[PDB]
Amino acid sequence: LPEDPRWELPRDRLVLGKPLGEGAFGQVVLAEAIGLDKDKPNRVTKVAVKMLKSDATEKDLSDLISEMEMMKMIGKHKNIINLLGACTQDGPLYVIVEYASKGNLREYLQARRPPEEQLSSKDLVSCAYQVARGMEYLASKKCIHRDLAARNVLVTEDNVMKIADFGLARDIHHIDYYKKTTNGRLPVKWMAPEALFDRIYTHQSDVWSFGVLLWEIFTLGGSPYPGVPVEELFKLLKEGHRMDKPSNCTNELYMMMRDCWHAVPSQRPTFKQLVEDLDRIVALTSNQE
Ligand SMILES: Cc1ccc2oc(-c3c4c(N)n[nH]c(=O)c4nn3-c3ccccc3)c(C)c2c1
């Protein structure tokens, strides 16, 4: 691998810890990084580290590198999972990014359903706002996420939402429409029709996915189209079906979901617009229920 001193961390400054997840991407572990900031060389920072599995191919390496390189280019934002450093020399590739201690947004919402304190309506709108803000930043850097969903939003110790996995390499022509998430759900349920049917990914199709994520927020981690298999989903979308309004959701916020699901991509709102609308809605939202 080519040396890049902008990002290199000596690997004896990385104390590897417990796993966070394994799969086709390799494996991710929690870790402690000693002297990340050159200012404080005696401070440890909890971080997450991605590395390759043992039986990993030359393409597997190339995908991890392009993911690291994409993060380098995109730059930093409060509401995305930021690259912190890399271990690339004399050993296995380690890609180091911010650690979000409260896990993904789907799990976080589900743990706070009434029978870990319940979320106020302002907490929920503010969650949406922060995700929209991350996507606004990513879109401004010309980044199309392609798999925006609550499972790909991570929550920090301080309840900050961070978009994850915006830099993954995907061959969209090799998507397995039938492949489930570890949770048993079908990622096709977050795709715009023009991405699902025609493989056309845009900022406008990420806005479609954001609408689904909004629905996940206000159902507190609900599963979209529960029990609906791929073939029937295709039919629903061909017919123009749209998910029902969640209970505990204003008509204004449901109108936002429906606009994100506009049949015509050019007529959906932009993330810039959604940020402005959500900002207005946060201010007007009662944190008393
Ligand atoms: C390049 C890179 C390096 C380390 C990483 O670590 C995570 C991550 C988490 C994290 N950074 N904080 N908090 C978490 O809960 C968490 N889960 N995962 C994870 C791990 C595997 C699959 C899906 C989610 C990603 C997304 C990642 C990406």
Q: What residue type is 267 in one-letter code?
A: Q
Beta carbons within 8 Å of 184's beta carbon, 6+ residues apart: none
Burial class (CB in 10 A: 0-12, 13-18, 19+), 44: middle
Please give, one letter per residue, the 3-state secondary structure of 174-205.
HCCCCCCCCCCCCHHHHCCHHHHHHCCCCHHH
For residue 75, the SS3 value is coil
Distance separating alpha carbons of residues 76 and 137, to the nearest angstrom: 9
Pocket test of ligand 1: the residue of 79, 88, 97, 107 to mutate, having most ligand atoms within 8 Å of its CB, is: 97
Q: Which CATH architecture has domain 100-283?
A: Orthogonal Bundle (1.10)
Pocket test of ligand 1: the residue of 154, 155, 160 to mutate, having most ligand atoms within 8 Å of its CB, is: 154
Q: Which CATH architecture has domain 1-99?
A: 2-Layer Sandwich (3.30)
255: its two tokens: 């109108």
For the CA of 165, the closest atom of ligand 1 is 26
66: its two tokens: 């392009």
For the CA of 167, the closest atom of ligand 1 is 1
Beta carbons within 8 Å of 264's beta carbon, 6+ residues apart: none
Domain borders along the chain are 1-99, 100-283
Q: Decide: 19 and 27 in contact? Cβ < 8 Å.
A: yes
Distance separating alpha carbons of residues 261 and 169, to the nearest angstrom: 26
Beta carbons within 8 Å of 10's beta carbon, 6+ residues apart: 87
Q: Decide: 268 and 207 in contact? Cβ < 8 Å.
A: yes
63: its two tokens: 């995908």
176: its two tokens: 């397995």
Experimental technique: X-ray
Distances in Å between the alpha carbon of 139 and those of 26, 98, 126, 269? 27, 20, 20, 13
Beta carbons within 8 Å of 81's beta carbon, 6+ residues apart: 97, 98, 100, 154, 162, 163, 164, 165, 166
215: its two tokens: 């629905």
**Residue nearest atom 10 in ligand 1 by C-alpha distance:** 99
Distances in Å between the alpha carbon of 137 and those of 56, 163, 216, 249? 33, 10, 21, 26
Distance 140 CA to ligand 1 centre (A): 23
Distance separating alpha carbons of residues 213 and 217, to the nearest angstrom: 6
Distance separating alpha carbons of residues 151 and 129, to the nearest angstrom: 17
147 in catalytic set: yes
Q: How many angstroms is the resolution?
A: 2.0
- What order do you get walking across the sheet with 44-51 strand by strand? 14-23, 26-34, 44-51, 94-98, 83-87
124: its two tokens: 């929920």
Q: Which of 147, 165, 206, 277 is catalytic?
A: 147
Give the containing element (helix H, strand E) for 32: strand 26-34
For the CA of 68, the closest atom of ligand 1 is 1
Pocket test of ligand 1: the residue of 9, 18, 28, 168 to mutate, having most ligand atoms within 8 Å of its CB, is: 28
Beta carbons within 8 Å of 207's beta carbon, 6+ residues apart: 260, 268, 269, 270, 271, 274
Residues with CB under 6 A from ligand 1: 20-21, 28, 48-50, 67, 81, 95, 97, 99-100, 103, 154, 164-165
Q: Decide: 204 and 135 in contact? Cβ < 8 Å.
A: no
